[PDB]
Design a binder for this molecule. Structure first.
Ligand SMILES: *[C@@H]1O[C@H](CO)[C@@H](O[C@H]2O[C@H](CO)[C@@H](O[C@@H]3O[C@H](CO[C@H]4O[C@H](CO[C@H]5O[C@H](CO)[C@@H](O)[C@H](O)[C@@H]5O)[C@@H](O)[C@H](O)[C@@H]4O)[C@@H](O)[C@H](O)[C@@H]3O)[C@H](O)[C@H]2NC(C)=O)[C@H](O)[C@H]1NC(C)=O
Ligand code: HEM
Ligand code: HEM
Ligand SMILES: *[C@@H]1O[C@H](CO)[C@@H](O[C@@H]2O[C@H](CO)[C@@H](O[C@@H]3O[C@H](CO)[C@@H](O)[C@H](O)[C@@H]3O)[C@H](O)[C@H]2NC(C)=O)[C@H](O)[C@H]1NC(C)=O
Ligand SMILES: *[C@@H]1O[C@H](CO)[C@@H](O[C@@H]2O[C@H](CO)[C@@H](O[C@H]3O[C@H](CO)[C@@H](O)[C@H](O)[C@@H]3O)[C@H](O)[C@H]2NC(C)=O)[C@H](O)[C@H]1NC(C)=O
Ligand SMILES: *[C@@H]1O[C@H](CO)[C@@H](O[C@H]2O[C@H](CO)[C@@H](O[C@@H]3O[C@H](CO)[C@@H](O)[C@H](O)[C@@H]3O)[C@H](O)[C@H]2NC(C)=O)[C@H](O)[C@H]1NC(C)=O
Ligand SMILES: *[C@@H]1O[C@H](CO)[C@@H](O[C@H]2O[C@H](CO)[C@@H](O)[C@H](O)[C@H]2NC(C)=O)[C@H](O)[C@H]1NC(C)=O
Ligand SMILES: *[C@H]1O[C@H](CO)[C@@H](O[C@H]2O[C@H](CO)[C@@H](O)[C@H](O)[C@H]2NC(C)=O)[C@H](O)[C@H]1NC(C)=O
Ligand SMILES: CCCCCCCCO[C@@H]1O[C@H](CO)[C@@H](O)[C@H](O)[C@H]1O
Ligand SMILES: CCCCCCCCO[C@@H]1O[C@H](CO)[C@@H](O)[C@H](O)[C@H]1O
Ligand SMILES: CCCCCCCCO[C@@H]1O[C@H](CO)[C@@H](O)[C@H](O)[C@H]1O
Ligand SMILES: C[C@@H](C(=O)O)c1ccc(-c2ccccc2)c(F)c1
Lengths: 553, 553
């Protein structure tokens, strides 16, 4: 007998469990539903269903009515709605976490072993008719072909939301502290054990590495002086493992928290800024705590920089992304009255989803110069050649690509998307339409409805055979965007739950940690509260360039 | 100049922070207090403090007036009070955890590094004039001498509550899954990384070990047949590091989850019982799920066993210990309405407080046989010679020692108590009275008020010089016991918050985990719900012996 759970016979987050030889049952516990498949709603659930407006209608509300939102943001409604957005979206994410690559069920190993990525939906059972369940063709489409025909950039489609390369490199930097898939252990495993905003891309994902990067005086990180500017130290002074092209001299190899950050100037840019911010914070702490040792200075600066990161990510980063007329607000005290777990486990789906390579351009315009991919990648002098000011100015001015829509990944890095789709088959990620339901959306009935056009849809229909078969990452990047937006509804409705849970689930946001003393007092606490991208750069530079998550005007 | 925080200025959980050269500031955030030392009470706090009766008064109501309690236990008031017990107790424990031996302040490293025990009060600063802060003598009293005079048994004092050796051994077994101090790392460090009821004393503290214990058939653990009965395998078959006396060969030594269980038959007794249960559960689980592989069977059996452990501990173990007339109840649903973090970190103070060596008798009686310590300690054949039935009957009939009150540790194991005090001093654990205040009690104003007598108190006053210099462990053990109880006011009021947070803070108690599917359905769920000490033994033995946490009549 075939595995019944492969029909995904249970709705609204019921758990399919195999009983006997050919039977299944569903645990509808606290899903709001009753019956064999969990399809009969309870009186409260039912009432909330008819009164629930569609995610599209709410997206419209958040992106329209300039007059209403000016009023809202200047009142308490701002706090009310922020609380609402925080609790409602985060709660889609389980906590404690549930499944992983090895276990499609709750276990003590899945709870304790942090080297695993987690998952929101279990893998597609191995003992089933099609690789995506029961629907679709015997074999899935070629990963290279799907990229070439649907994801490969022809002409450059800029972001209509005005997103720049200062954002793209921030996104890439930031996300790589909690996305470190391991090569040795394989797919579904991770090296970044903080599982969130620990800043291990600055300090290191292990103690040994951290100790090697630290000056062990004044709580500071090691640094070097090139042309009068403070840069991260050479590998000769901080002998940590760094991935540089073999043959490159060690004196030109810079050492930072994250191994891959030397391969791109944009990465090594932010690495410098944050390092330069860390030591600056030590200078402020030491002035008010002359008696504090090196360890106290270091550990307190880290917490201040963890706070600063989340403040900028929520109020500036997600702001630019969402395009919302709601002024987003970082205030942990909002959740102090609700049931919220201050813990987080990074999920493979969020890893898959955060592959935002369409942000990368055709070239890299720095002042009058234009730089090719072969001049930008691996170049180790560019950062020290131009300086922070000049590179931040150049990245804040150049537009970034539109993520959704399709055909917008520059040929140089298309291979990544190919491997993403490949990896999304070793992990046996459920089909896109199943995730639609998990994150509270209606499944698509056609490829037409998915893309909003006719041409590119009809070809996908022939390849996949069924919309119920469409894969996760292709689904996200081919779906029609919201009008004049950066990506589709699915990226928002699925991304944000993961995103917000990570930010607010950080221990520093808890009632226990969100105190003045935690950050060395009012001075440190205000540094978190008033943090800003512009301030992160311009307080650490000689001059102040144009710095923003969006192109001028 | 003298460190201001040595005086412990900040009352009611306010945090002392050094500013400038000789100044300090208190962070009264969310303590309920205002002002420089956190002594000015807010409107609600004042109301709370005047209306709140003394701990001793509550202990009176809970331990008296049986007629009222018969009524209470058969009504919803049982659930109401239990919730109050759960929420008010656990609240006294920081979550996420605060400090460790390295940091007397909040740091990311303290949060991330699960190798550390946590702590509730910071250490006594090294620059303080006296070892305990500001009060007492330049040198503390000799640790060996303190044990001899005040902790060493003369005549045997049985626990007035009727507590038996079945309890005493359960305690030692149960606790040694989350008390595993690292000799190679030093005090303040731990090997038990599950930090609670993970059953890592049955399955081992690491994966490679767990794997060696497992049959890898039907989710079962390895075992061997002896005399027709089920016993843990030899090291020869399951090669794991076991701490046995030098000269005892691998075939002679048994393999279990905790490395030290071979040293005592009572400890190895429970290793057998819990192993039989695990394999017994797997048999039930396979009948319900024939299509299940080995891994899922093992992982589910682990959760059911964790379930049963928490059920028994709360409803029988804590019951006998507390001696309350309130029928204590295990139901995670009680907490589904309040703010509760399903996370736990073991504290060095919980470690220190659980050294319940007074429980151990002058000698061990097994029917008509009287075994001395030298016959009992490291016996390899006693378990197999007698069997489970016979030794459950034996330990259940023999009285255990009264824990508090003083002079009740057998000379054989008095060296343990010595080392606890010496370790405390390395750990730089705050005075006993400082811990009184932190667990909502008033400090003792004299040694007479502590002990409830004249002689022992006078000698202690001479040794310590002041009551505010009295140490944690000696304090807990020399305090006047509640009338007819096992220990005093402090062991309950300091032990309970750690204990209940450890049980209910287990992720299986979370609304995400607490459902039938987690335990393979209803059969597994009911095993947890109806779990019992008597059943744990008697369902795994040929005959039922006397089984209880108290002696007969
Ligand atoms: C949780 O936390 C615990 C406690 O911190 C931690 O314990 C262990 O880890 C730390 C760090 O590994 C150990 O600390 C010791 O640190 C001293 C450092 O002094 C030296 O510093 C300079 C660097 O030394 C050299 O490093 C390498 C290797 O040789 C090389 O590049 C150079 O040669 C370089 O000079 C140097 O000036 C000089 O050598 C100094 O002596 C080390 O000397 C020592 O060897 C340790 O590494 C602790 O000892 C560890 N144990 C304990 C009980 O504290 C855990 O690791 C952590 N757990 C997790 C999961 O993170
Ligand atoms: C020109 C710049 C970029 C280059 C050269 C690049 C290249 C790569 C490469 C080579 C991989 C690993 C592929 C593999 O072996 O599996 C990768 C993965 C990834 N990319 Fe990029 N990419 C770029 C930009 C971005 C941006 C802007 C983002 C947005 C945040 C992003 C997000 C990710 C993520 C989250 C991973 C997976 C990380 C992990 O699991 O270890 N990338 N990219
Ligand atoms: C005759 C039986 C017992 C023996 C032989 C024994 C022996 C020991 C020894 C040798 C240590 C290590 C301390 C040191 O040497 O520094 C220890 C610690 C300890 N004991 Fe016992 N003990 C016994 C009974 C008990 C009981 C009944 C309890 C009650 C629960 C208990 C609780 C503990 C705890 C919690 C520790 C610290 C564990 C750790 O730090 O890893 N012991 N004991
Ligand atoms: C290992 O622990 C075992 C516990 O069984 C010890 O062996 C047992 O020792 C007792 C005496 O202490 C033996 O009792 C003897 O037989 C009868 C009772 O059956 C009794 O009336 C006699 O007076 C006599 O002492 C008991 O039979 C014996 N069991 C076996 C199988 O030999 C042993 O002494 C312990 N090891 C150490 C180092 O003490
Ligand atoms: C490392 O980053 C460098 C940028 O900071 C870059 O070197 C720069 O390359 C440009 C373009 O080739 C040079 O400009 C040259 O070409 C123009 C004509 O297009 C001439 O008018 C100029 O006089 C000049 O010869 C820059 O001079 C050069 N910058 C510096 C400071 O030397 C590298 O491309 C990056 N590294 C690699 C290996 O590609
Ligand atoms: C978190 O989970 C990881 C995967 O379960 C685990 O990695 C390791 O898991 C096992 C056990 O150590 C190893 O599996 C094999 O065991 C067989 C025994 O027959 C050997 O034939 C084989 O050589 C291998 O050792 C894996 O090697 C190993 N890695 C992977 C990717 O599976 C982690 O240890 C665990 N982390 C913690 C902290 O427990
Ligand atoms: C619960 O779901 C199952 C499986 O999806 C339903 O069982 C049927 O589903 C098909 C479409 O309705 C039928 O054609 C099949 O006879 C049967 N298939 C399987 C695999 O069981 C079932 O009807 C659902 N029940 C309810 C009440 O909605
Ligand atoms: C609370 O803080 C300090 C510390 O307990 C209190 O004691 C200070 O002042 C007292 C004189 O009025 C003396 O007891 C001590 O000399 C002094 N202690 C120190 C360490 O300087 C003080 O009374 C309280 N402060 C306030 C503002 O009420
Ligand atoms: O916030 C809300 O989150 C909900 C999550 O279920 C979505 O359905 C809504 O559209 C979104 O606005
Ligand atoms: C308000 O109407 C809204 O119009 C949007 C189009 O702008 C749609 O996406 C919404 O579903 C629709 O309700
Ligand atoms: C009728 C008896 C009511 C008992 C139920 C209330 C349980 C409160 O338990 C209370 O915990 C507090 C915090 O740890 C302590 O300070 C109190 O002394 C303790 O009794
Ligand atoms: C019933 C409950 C309470 O809060 O009173 C309670 C909870 C825990 C303990 C307890 C105390 C010390 C070690 C282990 C358990 C205890 F003695 C009493």
């Amino acid at each position: 007998p075939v595995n019944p759970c492969c029909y995904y016979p249970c709705q609204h987050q019921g758990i399919c469990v195999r009983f006997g030889l050919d039977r299944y049952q569903c645990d509808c516990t606290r899903t709001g539903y009753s019956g064999p498949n969990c399809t009969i709603p309870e009186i409260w659930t039912w009432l909330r269903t008819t009164l629930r407006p569609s995610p599209s209608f709410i997206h419209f509300l958040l992106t329209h009515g300039r007059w209403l939102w000016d009023f809202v943001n200047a009142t308490f409604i701002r706090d009310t709605l922020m609380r609402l957005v925080l609790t409602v979206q985060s709660n889609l994410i389980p906590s404690p976490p549930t499944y992983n690559i090895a276990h499609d069920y709750i276990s003590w190993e899945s709870f304790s072993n942090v080297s695993y990525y987690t998952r929101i939906l279990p893998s597609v059972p191995r003992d089933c008719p099609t690789p995506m369940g029961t629907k679709g063709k015997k074999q899935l489409p070629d990963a290279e072909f799907l990229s070439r025909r649907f994801l490969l950039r022809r002409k450059f489609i800029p972001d209509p939301q005005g997103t720049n390369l200062m954002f793209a490199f921030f996104a890439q930097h930031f996300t790589h502290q909690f996305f470190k898939t391991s090569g040795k252990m394989g797919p579904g495993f991770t090296k970044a054990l903080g599982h969130g905003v620990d800043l291990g891309h600055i300090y290191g994902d292990n103690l040994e590495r951290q100790y090697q990067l630290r000056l062990f005086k004044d709580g500071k990180l090691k640094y070097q002086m090139l042309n009068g500017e403070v840069y991260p130290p050479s590998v000769e002074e901080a002998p940590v493992l760094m991935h540089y092209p073999r043959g490159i001299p060690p004196q030109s190899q810079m050492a930072v928290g994250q191994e891959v950050f030397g391969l791109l100037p944009g990465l090594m840019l932010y690495a410098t800024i944050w390092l330069r911010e860390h030591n600056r914070v030590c200078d402020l702490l030491k002035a008010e705590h002359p008696t504090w040792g090196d360890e106290q200075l270091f550990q307190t600066a880290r917490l201040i920089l963890i706070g600063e990161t989340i403040k900028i990510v929520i109020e500036e980063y997600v702001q630019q992304l969402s395009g919302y007329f709601l002024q987003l607000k970082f205030d942990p005290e909002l959740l102090f009255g609700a049931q919220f777990q201050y813990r987080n486990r990074i999920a493979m789906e969020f890893n898959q989803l955060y592959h935002w390579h369409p942000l990368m351009p055709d070239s890299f315009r720095v002042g009058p110069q234009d730089y090719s991919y072969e001049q930008f990648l691996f170049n180790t002098s560019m950062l020290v050649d131009y300086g922070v000011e000049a590179l931040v100015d150049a990245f804040s001015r150049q537009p970034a690509g539109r993520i959704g829509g399709g055909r917008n990944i520059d040929h140089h890095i298309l291979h990544v998307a190919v491997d993403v789709i490949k990896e999304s088959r070793v992990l046996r990620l459920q089909p896109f339409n199943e995730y639609r339901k998990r994150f509270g959306m209606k499944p698509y009935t056609s490829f037409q409805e998915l893309t909003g056009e006719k041409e590119m849809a009809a070809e996908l229909e022939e390849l996949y055979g069924d919309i119920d078969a469409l894969e996760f990452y292709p689904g996200l990047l081919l779906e029609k965007c919201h009008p004049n937006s950066i990506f589709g509804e699915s990226m928002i409705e699925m991304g944000a739950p993961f995103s917000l849970k990570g930010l607010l689930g950080n221990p520093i946001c808890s009632p226990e940690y969100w105190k003045a003393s935690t950050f060395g007092g009012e001075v440190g606490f205000n540094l978190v509260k008033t943090a800003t991208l512009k301030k992160l750069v311009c307080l650490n530079t000689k001059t102040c360039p144009y710095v923003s998550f969006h192109v001028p005007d």
